[PDB]
C-alpha cells in the first residue's frame, strides 16, 4: 500500500464569496511602509543613551516624585468651610 489520502474526498477552492468592489483607494507604497515601521517599532527598539534617558525618567523619577507628593500630602489638607485664621492642614 502507498500511503496517500483517500480518493473519496472531493476537494476544491476556497471562495469566500465577497463581491469584489472597485478601487476606492490608491495605495501609495511609501506611506504604507512608514506605517509598518511605526507599527512594529517594538521589534526593532534597542536600548541606547536616549532611550534609557526617557525610560528611566518616565518609569523611575516621575513615579517616585508623584509618590513622594502623595505620601506626604496623604491626610494633610481638609478645608471644607474653613475660615480666617484657621489652619487648612491637619499636621505640621
Amino acid at each position: 500500500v502507498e500511503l496517500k489520502p483517500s480518493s473519496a474526498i472531493q476537494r476544491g477552492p476556497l471562495n469566500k464569496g465577497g463581491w469584489d468592489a472597485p478601487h476606492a483607494l490608491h495605495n501609495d507604497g511609501a506611506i504604507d511602509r512608514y506605517a509598518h515601521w511605526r507599527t512594529f517599532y517594538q521589534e526593532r527598539f534597542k536600548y541606547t543613551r536616549a532611550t534609557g534617558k526617557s525610560t528611566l525618567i518616565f518609569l523611575v523619577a516621575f513615579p517616585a516624585l508623584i509618590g513622594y507628593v502623595a505620601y506626604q500630602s496623604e491626610g494633610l489638607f481638609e478645608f471644607a468651610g474653613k475660615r480666617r485664621g484657621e489652619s487648612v492642614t491637619t499636621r505640621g
Partner: peptide, 26 residues
C-alpha cells in the same frame, strides 16, 4: 537637517531609508 530626535532613531531603522527631513512649510 537631522535633529536630535531624528538621529537618535538611527539604530532602529533597519532597512528603512534614513531620509534627511525638510519641513514642507519651507
Amino acid at each position: 537637517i537631522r535633529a536630535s530626535f531624528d538621529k537618535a532613531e538611527e539604530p532602529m531603522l533597519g532597512d528603512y531609508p534614513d531620509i534627511d527631513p525638510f519641513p514642507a512649510q519651507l
